[PDB]
Design a protein around this ligand. Sequence first.
Ligand SMILES: *[C@]12=NC3=[C]C([C])=C([C])[C]=C3N([C][C]([O])[C]([O])[C]([O])[C]OP([O])(=O)OP([O])(=O)O[C][C]3O[C](N4[C]=NC5=C4N=[C]N=C5[N])[C]([O])[C]3[O])C1=NC(=O)[N]C2=O
Ligand SMILES: Cc1cc2nc3c(=O)[nH]c(=O)nc-3n(C[C@H](O)[C@H](O)[C@H](O)COP(=O)(O)OP(=O)(O)OC[C@H]3O[C@@H](n4cnc5c(N)ncnc54)[C@H](O)[C@@H]3O)c2cc1C
Lengths: 554, 554
Amino acid sequence: MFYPDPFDVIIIGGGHAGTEAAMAAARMGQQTLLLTHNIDTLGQMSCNPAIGGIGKGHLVKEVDALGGLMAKAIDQAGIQFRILNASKGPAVRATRAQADRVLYRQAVRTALENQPNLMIFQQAVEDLIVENDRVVGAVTQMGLKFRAKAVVLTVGTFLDGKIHIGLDNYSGGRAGDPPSIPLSRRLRELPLRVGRLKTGTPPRIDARTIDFSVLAQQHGDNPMPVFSFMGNASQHPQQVPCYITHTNEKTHDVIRSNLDRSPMPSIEDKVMRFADRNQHQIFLEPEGLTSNEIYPNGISTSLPFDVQMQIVRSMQGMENAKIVRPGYAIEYDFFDPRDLKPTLESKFIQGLFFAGQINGTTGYEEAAAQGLLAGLNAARLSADKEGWAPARSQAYLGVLVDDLCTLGTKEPYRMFTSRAEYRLMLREDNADLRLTEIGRELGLVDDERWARFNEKLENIERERQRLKSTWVTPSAEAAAEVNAHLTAPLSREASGEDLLRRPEMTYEKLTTLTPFAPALTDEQAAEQVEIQVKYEGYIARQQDEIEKQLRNEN
Amino acid sequence: MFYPDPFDVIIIGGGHAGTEAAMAAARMGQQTLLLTHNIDTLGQMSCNPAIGGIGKGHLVKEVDALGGLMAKAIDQAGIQFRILNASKGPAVRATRAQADRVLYRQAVRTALENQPNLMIFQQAVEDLIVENDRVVGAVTQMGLKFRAKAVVLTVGTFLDGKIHIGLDNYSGGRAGDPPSIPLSRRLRELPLRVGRLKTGTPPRIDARTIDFSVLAQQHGDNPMPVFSFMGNASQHPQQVPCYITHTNEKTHDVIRSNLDRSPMPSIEDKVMRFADRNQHQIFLEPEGLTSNEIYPNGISTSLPFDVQMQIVRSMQGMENAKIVRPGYAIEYDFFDPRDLKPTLESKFIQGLFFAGQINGTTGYEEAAAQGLLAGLNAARLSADKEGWAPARSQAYLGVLVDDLCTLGTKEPYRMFTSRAEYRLMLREDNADLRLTEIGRELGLVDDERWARFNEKLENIERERQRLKSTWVTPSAEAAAEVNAHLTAPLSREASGEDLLRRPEMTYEKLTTLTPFAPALTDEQAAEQVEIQVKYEGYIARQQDEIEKQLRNEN
Ligand SMILES: *[C@]12=NC3=[C]C([C])=C([C])[C]=C3N([C][C]([O])[C]([O])[C]([O])[C]OP([O])(=O)OP([O])(=O)O[C][C]3O[C](N4[C]=NC5=C4N=[C]N=C5[N])[C]([O])[C]3[O])C1=NC(=O)[N]C2=O
Ligand SMILES: Cc1cc2nc3c(=O)[nH]c(=O)nc-3n(C[C@H](O)[C@H](O)[C@H](O)COP(=O)(O)OP(=O)(O)OC[C@H]3O[C@@H](n4cnc5c(N)ncnc54)[C@H](O)[C@@H]3O)c2cc1C
């Protein structure tokens, strides 16, 4: 039997990719159906309760710039915010946040519920229905089939796996969840390449059995950074610090002695590879404001339960620690990204897209970006329009997509800054400047975001124009104060743009100086103008490099 | 392998029964292990987001009086509060609350997290380990066994079942959950009688596709009632009303025509049994303050999906309604309560208890009460002390337990007021008076509850003594005002107790009268004193009946 209404875009799964795909397709204006086997599980961070960092904050910022949901959700569910590489240059600076699991899950679900044009159905999909190489719809478990023009596939066989703990194992997608054996087998029936990977997670520690009085703390920055360009600081809930402990030589001895038990990143591999090192660093991270669990970062393994208990008790401050949920390793399948076009569409089957974990990607953020691109392109194919795949010179999503499609991967792929060929211009602060307009050309950007972006652009342009017009002469009285804040006194009249390019000074002092005061009321605009001017020489050299490379690129 | 530490009480499952059992055993002061297969699912309402009513508010109040958790949790997660049978006599009135699902789940989880002496471990248990008829411990899935003296079993084979939807079916304990096939089969391997039952639930409706402008509303009372004796009104979150619609003759025609498709309480059975009736009543109940789902009460069936869609669209105001989660019926097993002693212990296996859904009882409250009793008795057996089982003349839990153990049941058992042999004294307002002291004799009652109870008893006794001492004479000036509020003028000096026994007057007017003013500052004490005096004649007659019946009872 067929559901009475016809749908245009069908998003299977409910991961992070499914969330982004549904939001994008519905926001564009098409009729969308999201199929999931458990609604209460929507927006669940499987293992690491953290978002952002080096090579992943850029993806989140791009998704936000196109109109995604991850940045706003994390602002609403973030408890500690830090800036990595804060001292170093902006091209490398990044943001990271520790995420409360409950708050994040509620924010995602509430955001999905209120989306117009979106219908969510809680039923497991067992098959795909196709007619002469064009996918027509999906088939659920109870026998009800849905029809649509474009289908985005998320977790077809990712959930076909087995949890491995020590010598034992049992089929399961995650901690106590059913496998997607039907869909995985069905997809395997199709002619595509398949590879196998494994992922391991460490145990959770009861918070009450650990002594925090003997450990050092790390706290967030001040003032707190905000991910999305629209959001501000006050949205963030109350903040909690993380604690730091160090593995002992006794734990090294335990791992060395007991590695034979392992069936074989992981703690045991980390110790084996680096025998010279004698101690590590471990971060205890809260799993919520209303939870008594501690996530230890950096003790991963597949060691049996008793070994894990020994290892965690051997560490400082965790003599009496108790484990609420054991660590474990899980297998899963995926399909090689070498068969997907630059828009993520499958060449073997028409109308079919692959996104997220099914493309051998671990992190939450990379899965979300893949999902946004695949959902956007499936919706565009629905309305019979051209697809849009970013260029490697456009944004980090472009680099990730191109590498996934062409180079391939025999293992999980992790984004890195060094992989980006255009690193000095691909900066988080300007991510929106590189995508918002194009987003508005696809309809993803709504009115408030567009108005804010246009105001930002106008302020940047006006401030730059005034800077170029401004002229400062050494003969002025303030020149003395200018000479106070200059390595050498002025010899001839200098413009604002010329003066600010000096590596020994920044826009702060110019704002302090009467001629260059006052400053832009918009902090992001002021930072962008400072980057353009102070880094005007380096930015110009990089622009020359970009032009030279794009000559062959174009 | 064996977990290093030895535990005394082991609760299996994580339902409402398991929640109560763990809380009671830990409160007593023993080392408790609660085993479950998903911590995120703790305290989940599976069928109806409602707690209380007729024959079930009494159980919740008894659990609260003993020192349970359901009353406080519901006060913290309830959105609409009503009093059923408010106009009628106190021995029949009851409380009901429509409760948010998310808030309730959070409250239960946080309450279990901070319980001293309690260790929660998340891993499915596959077997029981026994040594010459005495259960020694439990066996999980990964191969780690736990040892203890008393074991309370909750869902050993309840989760062994199949969801039936229309013609199709598939194994599952609930919507998208794994079955407990291993434990159920293992228990079946034991020599006990087993029966099969089935339960059905209706679909959830998207809230955005229903028109609430054409429906009547029902709102809670004012001031709001509070379940627990310790709690007050302000704890309750913001309140939402329910909406009412009525099934049409068209839906009756649909059910009559399509009942053949059903594989066969249920809507179809309700229509078939009462052919004379032409219309029903349906209540649309919110599933949370932050959810877009509507639970329709009274359209249950196992009808296939298209039939359910027709039925829900035929009803008034739901022409365009859409279904997020389909309705369905699930099978499950259970063991006849005729093999359990009055304390719930199994005669076939020593040290083994059965509680909750495994005893046939369906509702949340009956399962919770069974769990409290079974956990208390398992803890007492752990410390080698005498078990405690209530008498049918003591509290509704006593009646439920005795009927379950003695009479038996071939189907789910639902508590009713009429089943209670002592209905005029088994009143909710005095439930604590009948249990708190005994609870303190078992240690379940902590210090704050005991102090409040003692203050309540002292106030009741003092007010009663003053009432008996008080004498009112017709010769006083206020007697005129007394004659104002009396059917007949006073002929001789009358005491407070004598005057208040008049069916034509209540303690309110006595408080208004100068001699009987002021009133007790404690509302519960004032109500209890009014019940004792005004119903002094009826209560005395019932006390005589109780004594006569207990002569044979003792
Ligand atoms: C139902 N309809 C319906 C209708 C009406 C009018 C009433 C009064 C009741 C129902 N119910 C029953 C209702 O849901 C009931 O009150 C309650 O939800 C079920 O009992 P409860 O509270 O004890 O929860 P449950 O399901 O038993 O949780 C068990 C728990 O045990 C854990 N666990 C751990 N290891 C396990 C295991 N379970 C099983 N095996 C193993 N190895 C689990 O984590 C569980 O959380 C209706 N019920 C229904 O299912 N459908 C209806 O339509
Ligand atoms: C350092 C690091 C460590 C990591 N460690 C782990 C680890 O130890 N263990 C681990 O599991 N992951 C691990 N990950 C991956 C991480 O969990 C991912 O970011 C994310 O949790 C999984 O991808 P996803 O966002 O797409 O969610 P998904 O898991 O892919 O969610 C898929 C959704 O599809 C829905 N669905 C609906 N119908 C079906 C169906 N028929 N079949 C399947 N699903 C269906 C499901 O409800 C499910 O919620 C790690 C990542 C990093 C960076």
